[PDB]
């Protein structure tokens, strides 16, 4: 990684250029190696705020809710330099701050006009033990479409998201205890989706240096095969603990074998 730190103690002229500087380094990687590059911008709201304060200092009449007139244009320049080309594939992952927990604010309005995935991180499923709690039910990716990623991938993804939504509803009902285990289908989908929520964890290689849980890379085909074989009822006879912090599905089989002692 190459780091470009534009600190807060700098004026906003020197903070509305940090995205431009890191994007220029990544555009070197795109246009002279033809590489698969990642621009990680830790904050799009501070970029918009820095551009707002530049256009406030330059005497321009400000826009709506407090921002600059040039908001969509500046986000257009940067967020359209980070697009793919014929040679390389720069890709931004960007940490985004919404003000007042509002979505209709103009900085998230332009940001979500350029966004594609919006993966949620949270503490609820982290206090469920899964690290880190990337919420999928609140993460609406645009590429999730069987015309783009394939019919098997989209079928598995719809099955997983539907079975966790149904688990959230039946978790509410089993928490209030109305039918107490509502049916065999209720207990079946609770067992399946509890296994899936334990399986969404993955041991990370950056956490290998202080935790002995070795970090695995899991390719796309193995994720498809694993969630397809879990949703198909093939591994119903395994405990739910055999999926927590395991990389592929066959190592979850071996973990179920090594737990049976």
């Amino acid at each position: 990684v190459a780091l470009v730190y534009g600190q807060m103690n700098e004026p906003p002229g020197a903070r509305a250029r940090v995205a431009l500087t890191g994007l220029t380094v990544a555009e070197y990687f795109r246009d002279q190696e033809g590489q698969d590059v990642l621009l990680f911008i830790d904050n799009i709201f501070r970029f918009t705020q820095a551009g707002s304060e530049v256009s406030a200092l330059l005497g321009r009449i400000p826009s709506a809710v407090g921002y600059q007139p040039t908001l969509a244009t500046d986000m257009g320049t940067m967020q359209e330099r980070i697009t793919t080309t014929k040679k390389g594939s720069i890709t931004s992952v960007q940490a985004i701050y919404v003000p007042a927990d509002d979505l209709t604010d103009p900085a998230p309005a332009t940001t979500f006009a350029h966004l594609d995935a919006t993966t949620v991180l949270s503490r609820a499923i982290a206090e469920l033990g899964i690290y880190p709690a990337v919420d999928p039910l609140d993460s609406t990716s645009r590429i999730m479409d069987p015309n783009i990623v394939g019919s098997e991938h989209y079928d598995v993804a719809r099955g997983v998201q539907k079975i966790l939504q149904d688990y959230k509803s039946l978790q509410d009902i089993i928490a209030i205890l109305g039918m107490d285990e509502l049916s065999e289908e209720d207990k079946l989908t609770v067992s399946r989706a509890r296994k899936i929520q334990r399986f969404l964890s993955q041991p990370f290689q950056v956490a290998e240096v202080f935790t002995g849980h070795l970090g695995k890379l899991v390719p796309l085909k193995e994720t498809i095969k694993g969630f397809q074989q879990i949703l198909a009822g093939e591994f119903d006879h395994l405990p739910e603990q055999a999926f927590y912090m395991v990389g592929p599905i066959e190592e979850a089989v071996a973990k179920a074998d090594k737990l049976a002692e």
């Binding site: 009449i61 709506a64 809710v65 209030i176 109305g178």
Partner: protein
Amino acid sequence: ATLKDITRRLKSIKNIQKITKSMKMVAAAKYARAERELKPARVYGVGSLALYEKADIKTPEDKKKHLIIGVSSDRGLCGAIHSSVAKQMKSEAANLAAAGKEVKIIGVGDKIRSILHRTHSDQFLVTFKEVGRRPPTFGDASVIALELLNSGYEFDEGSIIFNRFRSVISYKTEEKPIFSLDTISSAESMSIYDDIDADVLRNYQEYSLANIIYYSLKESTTSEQSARMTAMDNASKNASEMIDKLTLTFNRTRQAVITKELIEIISGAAAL
């Protein structure tokens, strides 16, 4: 609207939503208690109804003294329970208006007399209070039987309109025949049976009153807690939806206030 108005409104409905979830969980706990209490009292009552079904004595006609026993809740906030009970009660009252005369009635709870201050405000004879706070027992049903019998009144026919429990979502409002005087009993089927002397059978009849009133009270309290849990679930959902709508209009009002104040300051500094 203004900004402080929508802030007040959102505070009010967030509190109503939290309190309605609290009522939902209280109704769920009392529902679980009433459901686990419902198992012995169901068999007791269906045994009494089974002995009155095998001894299927009919009702003698062309007499007066009828009795409707309204058994429901005292404290509402539980859906369309008391509406259905009052509907069935006044339908039986209009059916017992023709060819019956003494439709003097008894009822429990504040809500039954509160839904009967207008149409039959003369005919309600006794009313009860503090039902549905504690779970219903047998000694309070004994108090109902003593206030029906020792407070002297004689009746030959009528109905005990009880809230019938069926499921977590549904319920039922329907009657049971209350066979009342010994002559209704000792007509033919007791002459087939044995040891049917007047005192034994009338003490049996008073105990049958206490029996069906116990069954009615526990059935009505279980239906009360089920429908109250359903009503507070739906009210929490409607309050959460209106919190979402009012938060959206609060945010757009906030942005309009910021843009208005900004345009005033910029217009001042430009016209300077």
